[PDB]
Design a protein around this ligand. Structure first.
Ligand SMILES: [Ca+2]
Ligand SMILES: [Ca+2]
Lengths: 531, 534
């Protein structure tokens, strides 16, 4: 059968949960036995979200191919269990750069390069690019493309036009349009208004797009009488009007959309092959979420506290590790700067059962993260260091030996002992790593050969390897040639669990398929909870 | 006094004469004794219009600094007599190319780059850049910025928004808004429609711009009773509503706007220094336009026929040369392809008095232009070759000598005799100096031994073939200061009265009030040819 295209558009208010709404539909379609790939059209002029502040706009997701993408790609990968390419994230900057480059080359044969067709054509080409067969020659069944930004925006105007152009290229039978809108509840009158959805569909119909289904994001349950009024008001089928109330968990949303029969409506409208939903895997996850046997507290020693979206994949990997042990993970958002002193670190990491050191990119406060490891080693708390975390474990290890001036060249260039230095060369995407047999990392992974996603340029100095080894720390994980240090660990006879990784395992972690390092880390924190 | 900004916005229909309406206002303000600089905002994504087809979108104007700009810059330069910089032509492509480069450099420091403010900021920076003092430290009095495209388009939306921010940042006393609209005449009812003007002003008011004056482009005279109705309908001052009927000539438009007192209204509203218009120079031009003593036919041997906008500066330079002799120039648009054969060239260039070979950039049909020179040399017609024209004179000169396979490397790369070749080579753009041979035809025209002209080419004359080309009688009268590059070629008067070729484009430096000496000498030579048939 021909490849289908589903477009998810957002109106009225922003950050409604449009990413999760689309991912949950992707989960249902994959559970129905279909090849589903997902794309996100960000309307900002930035080429890569790498230049953007992660503590203001969210974490930078890294794919297997080594592309810096939006955090929405992470939601897609977790809900599908499938690895996505770099082409899954399209920006206004990426499109406008490609079109201007071609114009300067003379690839438009003496024509006035305008948004329509030149820009809309490039967007259209990037959308239809997902329909091409992937690795092992597999063509997808349905492509869910999320058109970012509010319907009616200047930055969203060319992306919606390309989505409309695709609808006329393939036909009504191959293209579906889903629109997410907010239904607000007024406290003094005690009634929900249909006016925001009415003008949102009108703004979408003015640009030339007729929506097939409507997602009504609300705090309460939308009544059948009100749903019937919206159905006539927007000329949307009554079976297509979906009431999506605020779910207790993000993993409850696929069950909410299934109850409203949206997944069955999508298959029937696009004439896709029908097959019942296999809840066997998702029900096992829901049982681990709603029925936990234990509660474990794990501290996240990050630069900026409270904000979950700065370390979204890290927090999701921690919860995933907890589900394997059938326990609830309470993330303690600890500010790194407070752990600079041994007294301050003790007051912040006192009541916790585990300590995690995430990878800080372009940060300046490193001394706090080093101090957090120093306390955790003395108290006997399990430590999991990611990217900068491994670098901080190495600095603390060298400092405990006797090297008082041991630091990273990235933070202190005039250091007389640079234990962390370039060569430099930037590492992005999946990199292979050989593991030492019978080690803590080998016991977790249960294999001597692994592959993890990287995003850094600073490595462990090979000259200081002997001086660092004096602390007891062992370089269990190295590159195939053994030149680059990938994993560091303390033996169980010295510390139960102090493992550091140069890569980001949180990206490869899924709620249905948790990462073995996070499983071993959460498990070690449960062992700490006893006594 | 503080630098003023005037914004010209076009609505409803396109190509009505937005460029000419703005240039005529620029002419009046300069005639009132004010430093006027003009800017054109193009909404296309092309960084330089040099990549565009000239026979589809118009000629590509070259400034003194060496920038490829829109043909509207040419209208500004001719109506002001002032040389404009590369900053006078700002495109969507330029703005987006700068902001994306800035973003990648991290100059926006962890921020989501959006149209508002990042894009509008670059446009606002580009407009305010014209207000900066020019060469010898001279700051302009008023800056006329023309916003290309219809008011209401998504492509021209950030350019209008920047003008609104310029109005906000500087003030109402320093920023003026002019809107050009069409008033159509209905044949069955016999009345003018106010609806296209009302809907256009409403579209300008919806984006947040209140127009100060309205230009009503019409075929007939707009009545004072109708002008009063539109004034109230658009909330524009009655003294600001200007009726602009279709003028017989493009040089009549400044006189039309002066009669409606638009120039005086602009000065009064912006609180600019008032001084009466010095018509001394413009009236002399109008007399040469409307009262010609002679009529001379000059053929324009170009690849495409009839389309004037492809060779706009060339046609305007030809008319300018005619005004100096107080004569009307009838341009004969001749297709180059037809002049390939000697019989076809004779049938096309038979009744003409002068032959002109313009500069064809990115063209393929060169053999026709060579054949046109071959006939003109035999018939005894004056020849003026521009850029490719000089190259074609050189090829024809070498071919008459005996080199049957002599051609340009640009058109035939496998030629055994490349008389025209690069140096890969280097692209020459802008004003380049040239030393002239004393007592030569070009020196007699220019009346100086040292000249400067604007270039836009990559291929030069092969210095190895200089001796073989010289056998025809052709002399390299114009060369670079070092003498390595050939700039001008000419035949002696004892061989041919006027066969002059130039490597550069003199048509760009030609003005209606200040004509180019080469075009004056060429038109004059064509008048001499007419005298020879009596
Ligand atoms: Ca985001
Ligand atoms: Ca044009």
């Amino acid at each position: 059968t021909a490849t289908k295209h589903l477009f998810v558009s957002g109106g009225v208010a922003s950050s409604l949960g449009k990413g999760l709404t689309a991912s949950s539909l992707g989960q249902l379609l994959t559970a129905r036995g279909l090849h589903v790939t997902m794309q996100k059209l960000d309307p900002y002029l930035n080429v890569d979200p790498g230049t953007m502040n992660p503590f203001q706009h969210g974490e930078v997701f890294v794919t297997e191919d080594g592309a810096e993408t939006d955090l929405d790609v992470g939601h897609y990968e977790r809900f599908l269990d499938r690895n996505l390419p770099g082409s899954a994230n399209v920006t206004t900057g990426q499109v406008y750069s490609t079109v201007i480059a071609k114009e300067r080359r003379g690839e438009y044969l003496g024509d006035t390069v305008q948004v329509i067709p030149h820009i809309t054509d490039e967007i259209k080409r990037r959308i239809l690019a997902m329909a091409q067969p992937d690795a092992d020659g597999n063509r997808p069944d349905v492509v869910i493309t999320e058109i970012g930004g509010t319907v009616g925006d200047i930055e969203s105007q060319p992306f919606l036009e390309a989505a409309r152009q695709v609808r006329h290229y393939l036909g009504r039978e191959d293209v579906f349009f889903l629109h997410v809108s907010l239904v607000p509840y007024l406290a003094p009158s005690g009634e929900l208004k249909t006016k925001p959805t009415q003008h949102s569909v009108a703004a979408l119909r003015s640009i030339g797009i007729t929506p097939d289904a409507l997602i009504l994001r609300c705090d309460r349950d939308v009544p059948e009488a009100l749903k019937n009024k919206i159905a006539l008001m927007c000329d949307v089928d009554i079976d297509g009007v979906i009431s999506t109330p605020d779910a207790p968990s993000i993993y409850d949303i696929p069950k909410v959309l299934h109850r409203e029969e949206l997944d069955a409506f999508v298959v029937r409208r696009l004439n896709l092959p029908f097959r019942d939903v296999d809840w066997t895997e998702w029900d096992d996850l829901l049982r681990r979420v709603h029925e936990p046997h234990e509660t474990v507290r794990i501290a996240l020693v990050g630069k900026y506290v409270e904000l979950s979206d700065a370390y979204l994949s890290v927090a999701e990997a921690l919860r995933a590790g907890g589900f394997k042990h059938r326990a609830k993970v309470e993330i303690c958002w600890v500010a790194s700067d407070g752990c600079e002193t041994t007294s301050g670190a003790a007051a912040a990491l006192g009541d916790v059962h585990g300590v995690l050191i995430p990878g800080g990119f372009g940060i300046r406060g490193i001394e706090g993260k080093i101090g957090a490891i120093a306390y955790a080693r003395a108290r006997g708390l399990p430590v999991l260091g990611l990217c900068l975390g491994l670098q901080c474990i190495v600095i603390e290890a060298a400092r405990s030996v006797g090297l008082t001036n041991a630091n990273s060249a990235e933070f202190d260039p005039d250091t007389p002992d640079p234990v962390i230095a370039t060569m430099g060369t930037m590492r992005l995407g999946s990199y292979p790593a050989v593991l030492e047999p019978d080690s803590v990392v080998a016991q977790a992974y249960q294999t001597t050969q692994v592959s993890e996603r990287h995003r850094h340029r600073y490595e462990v100095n090979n000259a200081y390897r002997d001086k660092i080894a004096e602390s007891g720390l062992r370089f269990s994980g190295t590159s195939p040639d053994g030149h680059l240090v990938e994993f560091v660990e303390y033996p169980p006879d010295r510390h139960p669990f102090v493992v550091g990784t140069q890569a980001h395992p949180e990206l490869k972690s899924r709620p249905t398929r948790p990462h073995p390092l996070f499983v071993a880390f959460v498990g070690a924190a449960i062992d700490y909870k006893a006594g």
